[PDB]
Amino acid sequence: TYVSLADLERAARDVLPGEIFDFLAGGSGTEASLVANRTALERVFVIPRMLRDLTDVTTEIDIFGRRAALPMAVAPVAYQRLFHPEGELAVARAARDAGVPYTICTLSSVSLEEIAAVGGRPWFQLFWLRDEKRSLDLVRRAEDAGCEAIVFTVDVPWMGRRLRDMRNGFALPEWVTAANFDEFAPATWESVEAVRAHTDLPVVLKGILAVEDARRAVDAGAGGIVVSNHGGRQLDGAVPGIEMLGEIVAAVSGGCEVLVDGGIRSGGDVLKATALGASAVLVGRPVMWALAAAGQDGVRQLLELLAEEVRDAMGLAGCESVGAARRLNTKLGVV
Amino acid sequence: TYVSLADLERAARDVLPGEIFDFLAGGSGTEASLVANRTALERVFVIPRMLRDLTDVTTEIDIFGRRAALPMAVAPVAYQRLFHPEGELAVARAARDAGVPYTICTLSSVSLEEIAAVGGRPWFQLFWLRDEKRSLDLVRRAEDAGCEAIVFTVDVPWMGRRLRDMRNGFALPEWVTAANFDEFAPATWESVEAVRAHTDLPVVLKGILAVEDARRAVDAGAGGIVVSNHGGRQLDGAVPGIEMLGEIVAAVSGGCEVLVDGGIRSGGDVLKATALGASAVLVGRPVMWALAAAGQDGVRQLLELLAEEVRDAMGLAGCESVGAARRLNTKLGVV
Amino acid sequence: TYVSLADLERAARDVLPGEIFDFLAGGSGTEASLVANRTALERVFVIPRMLRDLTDVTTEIDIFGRRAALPMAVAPVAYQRLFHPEGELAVARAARDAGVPYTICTLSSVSLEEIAAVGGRPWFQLFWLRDEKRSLDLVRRAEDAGCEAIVFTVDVPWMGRRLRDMRNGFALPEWVTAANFDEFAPATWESVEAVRAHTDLPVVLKGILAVEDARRAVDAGAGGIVVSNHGGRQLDGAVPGIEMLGEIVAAVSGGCEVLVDGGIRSGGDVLKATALGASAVLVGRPVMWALAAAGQDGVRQLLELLAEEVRDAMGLAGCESVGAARRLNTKLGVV
Amino acid sequence: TYVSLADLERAARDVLPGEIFDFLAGGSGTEASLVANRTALERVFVIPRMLRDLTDVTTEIDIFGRRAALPMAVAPVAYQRLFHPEGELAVARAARDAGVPYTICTLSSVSLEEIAAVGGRPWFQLFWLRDEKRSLDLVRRAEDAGCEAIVFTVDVPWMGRRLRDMRNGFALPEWVTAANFDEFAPATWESVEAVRAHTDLPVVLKGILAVEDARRAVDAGAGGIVVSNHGGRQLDGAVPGIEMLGEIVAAVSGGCEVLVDGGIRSGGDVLKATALGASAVLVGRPVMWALAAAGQDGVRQLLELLAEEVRDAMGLAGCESVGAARRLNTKLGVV
Numbered sequence A, B, C, D: 001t002y003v004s005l006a007d008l009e010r011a012a013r014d015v016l017p018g019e020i021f022d023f024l025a026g027g028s029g030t031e032a033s034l035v036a037n038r039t040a041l042e043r044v045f046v047i048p049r050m051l052r053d054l055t056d057v058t059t060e061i062d063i064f065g066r067r068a069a070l071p072m073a074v075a076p077v078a079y080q081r082l083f084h085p086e087g088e089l090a091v092a093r094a095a096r097d098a099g100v101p102y103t104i105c106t107l108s109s110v111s112l113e114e115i116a117a118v119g120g121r122p123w124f125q126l127f128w129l130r131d132e133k134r135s136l137d138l139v140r141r142a143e144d145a146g147c148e149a150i151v152f153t154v155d156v157p158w159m160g161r162r163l164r165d166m167r168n169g170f171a172l173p174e175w176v177t178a179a180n181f182d183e184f185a186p187a188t189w190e191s192v193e194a195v196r197a198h199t200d201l202p203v204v205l206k207g208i209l210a211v212e213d214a215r216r217a218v219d220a221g222a223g224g225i226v227v228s229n230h231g232g233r234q235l236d237g238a239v240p241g242i243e244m245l246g247e248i249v250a251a252v253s254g255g256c257e258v259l260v261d262g263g264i265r266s267g268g269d270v271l272k273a274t275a276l277g278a279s280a281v282l283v284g285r286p287v288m289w290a291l292a293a294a295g296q297d298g299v300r301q302l303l304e305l306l307a308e309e310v311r312d313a314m315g316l317a318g319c320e321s322v323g324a325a326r327r328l329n330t331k332l333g334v335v
């Protein structure tokens, strides 16, 4: 029985090979941004409300035309067969059963059509390829397979400097492949427009940190953004998304959904993100800890724990709905 | 001989069973709010005044129609027989002898009538029960028994996630029971009004952190509030009461008594709370350390030590009265 | 050869009995104010000036009608025979030879007349006694013996709670006595006026932290103040003097000399104090480390080291005089 | 293969004699300014831009009439034969090959003419000598030998207090000499004018921290300044250059080039400096680590690594040029 997400990290470190744990845990450069994602959440304190009606507390949201059970989705994480033989299928099944959106990756180790066939109304994460037509074909494949949103990753013109991976000499095992293929080009605003013109699905730009990039995303017709430094894996020294979130929420002024990720490790952290104005969060590494530890059942247990922590935090803060949580105030503290 | 409250924690850890010490010491979740209560006090520095008349320094206050010997009351702590066989009777006797109000709990391990019979003009802490009539009956019992205030706990719609208790598998021993009974409903503003209509006693709302909840408490006819995050035991990530206190004192503008709790560990901390505008503080865990260490005599020694530290701090700060201490200025520092 | 003041603390800890080292090193309560004195200096950074004329750098000041070789005096420290058999005579001789004022204490372990006979134009520190006439007699004795200023300590209505001393059971050895006597009353503004009326010497109020107490000191006819929390030995939680200094300097607006003490451990710290607006600093514990380590010669070496560090810091900061150092700007940093 | 600059420090500590490593690593006094240079960079976070054209990312700048391959030059470091037998020649050759300016020192252990003969369009660092004519002769020698800028060090009226060197009893080995000679006077604004009148080369004032000294530098006809606390080696307690940089850039308002140094340890740090407004950075200690570890080849590898890290950071931040990097915004964080 896991009582916190930290129980799952401990379990994952026990089971995973060192170099795979490092691929998962690590960030770029000195890992300043990786650590800052945690620091940034730990400095935020919530000002809870008391004495409100909690007779029907609901953690549900509506996002991109679907009801989700929590203000949370599984972040795109490449190559999930690194962590468990069932890889993406195990995670997608658990997410479906929990009513949480699952983000299918361009670099999934099981094909996007197979993962979509699990059900649960999935999203699809896009990397822009040097061959543009390949990019747009992936989008069409995703849409044909029933994916509900295109999560266009905009903070990877190329991969950051992963010093753990360099020092370990990390490479994919022969049994883990990019199953959507039988090489990255930097994406631009023109690429965003090409995607927006090629699909009826909401386009969500993942990796926005500058306020004017958030504004431009709305002007470009994005249905959402994810305020994110890519888990500290891209620019080392990039500001945490949680530190830009409030300013971005104010600037977009309801023009698109504003998600955040990086370091969400509890329902309390979800509450903090919501109180800062997020529509929803993504959770990355902890989902992989659960997958590594106990496969589909592990992910189920993680999502059940997160669901309980979110409900607990919301009610203790006087919030019968996620909208009420967005109206909570916060105060910065120390360490 | 104890020269600081930390001497008492050391003594309590030596004697108490691990799981009972954890029940006492612990907070919810990651214990962020528990630690922050201490951090928040440690960052506050007092700007003392010099050269004032100290020929009759008094630490007394008038609160809820009684003179108290210190600007302090014993916080409500459930199930005091966990810590010593005499439980609530030992603590209430020592509080009476020291001239400090004692808060009798809804979940007292000795009946409220027995504890009230000790004397010392006691307060009564109320949890709202699913059976409303039971709640109001407790209030009437408390009033009939001579309790002087109803401390309505408003931050426990349900109990927080106590991970130490979960990991220890903590349960009450068979010899510790809720002696007022022969199950919690979330309280609302309607519940507050039902209590206010059922008693002539001052109603004090314990667990207020939002400024508008403090204002609403005054509008609702509360005689006081306790600005509190429940010792870090309820919402993990709730702001410390000490960080909201000044803003709350300004907002209520003398409309009710404003108490604070969480992490008060010395007379200097009492002085800080007073300088930030508190009418009085509650002290929880240290009273239980003293009870565990040496029963009634332990609590007596703790209160004597606190009394000396409060007098010392006040005089060194140029304050002949608690009112003068409330007019002291403060300055935030680091670590 | 000592190259920093920290070399002297190490030497003093080696030689002194534990309880005497604790009497010297310790503060009140949790020692929060003791530690904060150091933290407060460490957070201040100087913005040095370049390319200024340094052909005649002088560290001299004029204060209370005497030229001093440095913007520094030896703080009042009671019972110096605790640290070395020559006690106050050793320190006073070294201070005289270095051109630094020495503060003779009310609780000196050698009589004030003997210490004054050393020469060097000494100051006299006054504690207010329950017998007022005794207080004023000490002032007259000091003036008759050639003391140049009365340093009236205003932050000791009684002694703070010295937990190291309590735990050690510290008491003076039989061979250390208060040599000025053959019991403290709290001083008030009336006491200050009684002293001011009884002497032509400048009266300096030591232990001022509140801005309005600094203003009142000027209105009361004080020739100076020492902005000070008594080395963290009095109110535990009192703000460091260095944190109030700039605001106090602005408020008194040249109306009296403004000294500071607490945690000065280098010439760089002297420069910081000067840049924040101090006329001069007092140095306490390090002078006693030097006395303990090597008697008069130790104090000589300490003052020579401090003199070199002050000259070094001033010149590197582009300051040919202490007045120029007072015009330096500062910036707060972290840790 | 080195993947970070920290790999090079480890390698240098392994090979160098302790006292030489200390000469290199150390700062003045308590090393507060040395540590603060690192702290100051670690607190700065970049707000990257996304989705910009990165088809021709260039790290080049034009400075003092030459194209440089990076916004970086090798800082002046005296006596490079302390670290490797080839000393300055090894470093200058690697800098030339990398297209990075190299600063030839007044206290070079190989003559300035020999180092200039390496090629690569070098700069010359000037210390003001007690014999003025000697100073101006060095300038003329430098200009005759093809140096492109005079980097006048303005923060060394004399050497700071290097406690590591004092404790080690550090002295130059007999085989390391000041090769430009067959003693320092404090420089003033008059000295700057004498240099400016004696050369057509741009004069760059190294060691400026005060905003009005930056303004005065422009008024005095400086072509650049280096905002610097001399690597924490001069005034202990001097503010880090990185903390003054933004204010200085605003004040000079394009009137001269504004460089910064102190603690640059990665391409990410270069990006931070650029985002705060620097034209370029200097790098000191890491170049010497590389020299100690592996001579010319070591310095080559260091500069290749820095070049890759700068390109990586710029592109991840959406910057196709250094000018675009200067337009990035930053946000302060914690630890």
Ligand SMILES: Cc1cc2nc3c(=O)[nH]c(=O)nc-3n(C[C@H](O)[C@H](O)[C@H](O)COP(=O)(O)O)c2cc1C
Pocket (backbone or CB within 6 Å): A023, A024, A025, A037, A075, A076, A077, A078, A105, A106, A107, A125, A153, A206, A228, A229, A230, A231, A233, A261, A262, A263, A264, A282, A283, A284, A285, A286
């Ligand atoms: C092992 C790993 C692989 C990832 N792969 C991708 C990816 O292919 N596409 C993408 O947009 N983000 C990717 N991310 C970033 C995550 O979507 C997310 O931004 C980050 O993990 C969130 O932080 P968290 O792990 O702290 O919850 C990856 C993260 C990790 C740890």
Ligand SMILES: Cc1cc2nc3c(=O)[nH]c(=O)nc-3n(C[C@H](O)[C@H](O)[C@H](O)COP(=O)(O)O)c2cc1C
Pocket (backbone or CB within 6 Å): B023, B024, B025, B037, B075, B076, B077, B078, B105, B106, B107, B125, B153, B206, B228, B229, B230, B231, B233, B261, B262, B263, B264, B282, B283, B284, B285, B286
């Ligand atoms: C073991 C324990 C039991 C508690 N029981 C109650 C309770 O029944 N009702 C209540 O309002 N507060 C309860 N509290 C909270 C305290 O009244 C108080 O808010 C908190 O302990 C103050 O912080 P301190 O312990 O840091 O002094 C309890 C606290 C502890 C540690």
Ligand SMILES: Cc1cc2nc3c(=O)[nH]c(=O)nc-3n(C[C@H](O)[C@H](O)[C@H](O)COP(=O)(O)O)c2cc1C
Pocket (backbone or CB within 6 Å): C023, C024, C025, C037, C075, C076, C077, C078, C105, C106, C107, C125, C153, C206, C228, C229, C230, C231, C233, C261, C262, C263, C264, C282, C283, C284, C285, C286
């Ligand atoms: C052992 C000791 C004895 C002291 N005695 C006196 C005293 O008799 N009168 C007084 O005004 N201050 C006294 N002080 C306070 C000092 O004058 C001074 O405020 C403090 O030591 C300055 O801080 P520093 O020790 O950090 O330099 C004493 C301090 C110490 C450490």
Ligand SMILES: Cc1cc2nc3c(=O)[nH]c(=O)nc-3n(C[C@H](O)[C@H](O)[C@H](O)COP(=O)(O)O)c2cc1C
Pocket (backbone or CB within 6 Å): D023, D024, D025, D037, D075, D076, D077, D078, D105, D106, D107, D125, D153, D206, D228, D229, D230, D231, D233, D261, D262, D263, D264, D282, D283, D284, D285, D286
């Ligand atoms: C061993 C050593 C010698 C130095 N010699 C000189 C010098 O002769 N002239 C000068 O202007 N700066 C000198 N500096 C300062 C550097 O130019 C530069 O300001 C500092 O090293 C930059 O910080 P960094 O080492 O953190 O990169 C020296 C620094 C070191 C570490």
Ligand SMILES: O=C(O)[C@@H](O)c1ccc(O)cc1
Pocket (backbone or CB within 6 Å): A039, A040, A041, A042, A043, A044, A242, A243, A244, A246, A332
């Ligand atoms: O300034 C803010 O309030 C915001 O940028 C912020 C959010 C989280 C945090 O930890 C620090 C700052």
Ligand SMILES: O=C(O)[C@@H](O)c1ccc(O)cc1
Pocket (backbone or CB within 6 Å): A078, A107, A156, A158, A159, A160, A184, A230, A233
């Ligand atoms: O963070 C990752 O590992 C993932 O986003 C990624 C995978 C391949 C790649 O080229 C760049 C990024």
Ligand SMILES: O=C(O)[C@@H](O)c1ccc(O)cc1
Pocket (backbone or CB within 6 Å): B039, B040, B041, B042, B043, B044, B242, B243, B244, B246, B332
């Ligand atoms: O802003 C304040 O002054 C107040 O919120 C506060 C009180 C105590 C504290 O530690 C930090 C902040």
Ligand SMILES: O=C(O)[C@@H](O)c1ccc(O)cc1
Pocket (backbone or CB within 6 Å): B078, B107, B156, B158, B159, B160, B184, B230, B233
């Ligand atoms: O903090 C506690 O333990 C106390 O307030 C409490 C007791 C029972 C309960 O259901 C909720 C809270």
Ligand SMILES: O=C(O)[C@@H](O)c1ccc(O)cc1
Pocket (backbone or CB within 6 Å): C039, C040, C041, C042, C043, C044, C242, C243, C244, C246, C332
């Ligand atoms: O606010 C200030 O500048 C002043 O109070 C201060 C001085 C020193 C210090 O460390 C912190 C604050």
Ligand SMILES: O=C(O)[C@@H](O)c1ccc(O)cc1
Pocket (backbone or CB within 6 Å): C078, C107, C156, C158, C159, C160, C184, C230, C233
């Ligand atoms: O700090 C001290 O020890 C000194 O100021 C002092 C001495 C005797 C006393 O009663 C009070 C203070």
Ligand SMILES: O=C(O)[C@@H](O)c1ccc(O)cc1
Pocket (backbone or CB within 6 Å): D039, D040, D041, D042, D043, D044, D242, D243, D244, D246, D332
């Ligand atoms: O105030 C600022 O923004 C600037 O002085 C600064 C730069 C870097 C830093 O770490 C702290 C402050």
Ligand SMILES: O=C(O)[C@@H](O)c1ccc(O)cc1
Pocket (backbone or CB within 6 Å): D078, D107, D156, D158, D159, D160, D184, D230, D233
């Ligand atoms: O930092 C140094 O070591 C260098 O700048 C220097 C060399 C000789 C000197 O006299 C002063 C400074």
